[PDB]
Specification:
This is part of a larger assembly, with two copies of chain A. By secondary structure, chain A is α+β, with helices and mostly antiparallel strands. The first copy, chain A, has helices spanning 33-36, 42-48; strands at 12-14, 21-23, 28-30. In chain A, strand 2 (21-23) and strand 3 (28-30) form a beta hairpin. The first copy, chain A, is globular. Chain B binds seven RNA strands through residues 18-21, 47, 49, 51-52, 54-63, 88-95, 97-104, 106. The PDB classes it as ribosome.
Chain lengths: 52, 106
RNA sequence: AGGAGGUAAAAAUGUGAAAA
RNA sequence: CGCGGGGUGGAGCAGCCUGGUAGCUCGUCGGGCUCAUAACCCGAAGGUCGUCGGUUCAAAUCCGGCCCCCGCA
RNA sequence: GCUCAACGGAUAAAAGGUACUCCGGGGAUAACAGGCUGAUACCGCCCAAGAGUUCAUAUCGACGGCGGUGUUUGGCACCUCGAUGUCGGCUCAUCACAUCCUGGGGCUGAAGUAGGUCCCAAGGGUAUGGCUGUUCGCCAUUUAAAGUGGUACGCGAGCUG
RNA sequence: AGCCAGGAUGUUGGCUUAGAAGCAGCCAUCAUUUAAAGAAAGCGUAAUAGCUCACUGGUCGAGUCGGCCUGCGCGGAAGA
RNA sequence: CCAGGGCUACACACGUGCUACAAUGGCGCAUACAAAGAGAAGCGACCUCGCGAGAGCAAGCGGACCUCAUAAAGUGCGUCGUAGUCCGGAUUGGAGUCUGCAACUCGACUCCAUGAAGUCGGAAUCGCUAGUAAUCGUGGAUCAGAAUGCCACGGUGAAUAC
RNA sequence: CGGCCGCAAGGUUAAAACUCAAAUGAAUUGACGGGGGCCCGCACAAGCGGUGGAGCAUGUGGUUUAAUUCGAUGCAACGCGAAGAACCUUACCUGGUCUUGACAUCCACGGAAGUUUUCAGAGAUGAGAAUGUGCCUUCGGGAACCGUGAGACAGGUGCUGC
RNA sequence: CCCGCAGAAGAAGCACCGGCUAACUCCGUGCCAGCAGCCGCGGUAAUACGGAGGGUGCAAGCGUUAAUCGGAAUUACUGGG
């Protein structure tokens, strides 16, 4: 089940070309990347993972 | 850092630093209330797009690492012997000696 | 011009995406 | 439900036997070397010795109870 | 005083194997069988939540308890070591009932039919092969059923090895 | 103790809002009219109606009913 | 838009500087010698008070003139006499001045006391050939207040380049 | 694979399935070489003084945190932006507030503006008691100035130096 | 085959649009969903992915797939090393 390691599952794309975080499972977009790297993970479960 | 905000202590379990830098495989022990339930959903593989310094021609090369979450809790095997089986067979087996014996073995 | 003698032990490696 | 080996840096072996006084290898931290790493070189913290007790100016040490593993039955 | 491994010390100098074995003895002492016993095994009852849709008395039944039979393994050495001389198969059986079938009945969550469970009953019947040295056991194909045990783990002065 | 009747008015009792009506499910465990009836065990029980025991009178009307201390017995008790 | 706080947080490592580990030196008294700069809601005589930072009166100058401004090393002499010492100086308690609404987090400076590390630095590594290295002192910009940071000048003044 | 040959090892003859859109030859311009010749430079050689060893100053990482803004981050970042963080600065955080706004133009309105100053208040702000009551008049008001209704917008030290 | 009435009334889609190969923009998603015959695009400023409009080619046909040949002088007698 966890075999897809490489270019298979792109759950949360973290880019630095424009510094934008996108969890495509829903589409919770955030332009505040650095804070997400240090705490803003709570928002991913409550919003995106709320419906699953 | 997210776990500290959740009061969970992130106990290190396993790690392996690379020959040049970075860790290859790392696992930790998060202890607390609603730790797994809230992380049971986070078994995804995040995608990283970052400017690469290791590549001399500093260009954005993608990077991948998988986030796997398992409860790790384990309560197992005690006793499974029941009375609905055990066809107990007690049959003999002969042996040896010196003149005329049947040294049996049930 | 013709032609000889003296003259270097060890040092591996760098994944992957850009040219009107 | 007998006899015995052992529990020493994070890991692995002497040091005990004949009572004070624990060395070294790997690892860890950093520096320098190359743009980076390894390697190399230098410096250094880190082990009172599973646990409890007696003896002595002094016990990880000599010995014994409890727990884990191993040899033969 | 070295000195008595066994410490009244066979001289203070001393290990093993024997299945050709041999001799002298023992059922004073073992293995098979019988005997006393019945821990264990086996079977049968008592109290009784729970499981089971609801309800424990359709069934099973934990927690524990009370007895029986003498078929498992054992316990003790009573009988035999101037012999009880062998496991299985073959042939031939015979008894018990705690019944595999067939018969007669009770209950049901037994509609019908087919089953499950319990009581009475021994009259008669209760497979053929593959594999194994086999009992047991697994498989194949049946059958109404392919019963559980005792009878020196029946039977070798009947056969085989 | 058998027998002949009664065994009820609100209570279609709250209900965790289509529900269990003495009765798989938890409860206060009612005030009443009375020679009289516990809002409670079993049956069909999803819930009914209904059949019972508590309880109340008429008949049989003498020893009766519930227990205890003990003797002797039955079942439990099935093998070649 | 605004008060307060942080940017100065601290079990750690590294880069970049000031001063020493002493006696070619420290302490004390007397004392000679500079260039370049800044000045007004500014720099500040002289003088007065004190151990000091500074307080007060306040001419001169919006400037080769006035002020900042006493240059410091060094020299003569005396003391200490090779120590963790009178070399060195952080930390720390207390009492002050400056600017500012305000000095606590969080300033500079001063006075008294205290007074360690450090006894010339490992592997390794950096700058320099000229009035350069090394070394002492001064001014300015920045600035309400306040640097060892930066810019600039002056004093002293080598060796080696086979 | 088969045939043949050979004592064996193997040799000889000789495909395909499949996979990619390249493989390859000479040569050209640079780059690079523990290739070479020559030359240059504190590269090293010859000396001198430092760093790392110590106290402290300052920056960053790390850690921490409400934030301890952000950027620079081999040579050519790290006494750097910052020619200087107690408020300010400040782009940060928390709290409290205004929200066509702090800066600015157009449509429409009243009022000289301003000022002494009080209460609540940390401040931002709200609500006042009054003095004053001005340049000029298309005189139902042109204009420095304050506030206000509202439609256009303003502002952005928010991101992107790929 | 011819004559009469009739409402334009009953009668238009397919492929492609970076280059090869005639012909374009915007928006949505961002090496994800997808495209393709080939070279290669999609990695937050896509003439190529999807939709909308427009345009190009063909036209009751239009694409796609399969197959033979030429292109292939890459089996060369013609006509190669």
């Amino acid at each position: 089940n966890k075999s897809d390691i490489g270019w298979g599952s792109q759950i949360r794309s973290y880019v630095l070309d424009d510094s934008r975080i996108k969890d495509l499972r829903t589409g919770v977009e955030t332009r505040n990347t650095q804070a997400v790297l240090d705490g803003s993970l709570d928002q991913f479960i409550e919003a995106s993972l709320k419906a699953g | 850092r997210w776990a500290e905000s959740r009061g969970f202590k992130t106990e290190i379990i396993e790690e392996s630093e690379g020959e040049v830098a970075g860790i290859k495989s790392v696992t930790i022990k998060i202890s607390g209330d609603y730790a797994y339930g809230w992380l049971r959903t986070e078994t995804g593989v995040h995608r990283l797009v970052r400017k690469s310094p290791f590549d001399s021609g500093g260009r954005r090369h993608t990077s991948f690492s998988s986030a796997f979450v398992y409860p790790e809790v384990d309560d197992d095997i005690d006793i499974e012997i029941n009375p609905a089986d055990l066809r107990i067979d007690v049959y003999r087996t002969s042996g040896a000696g010196g003149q005329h014996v049947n040294r049996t073995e049930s």
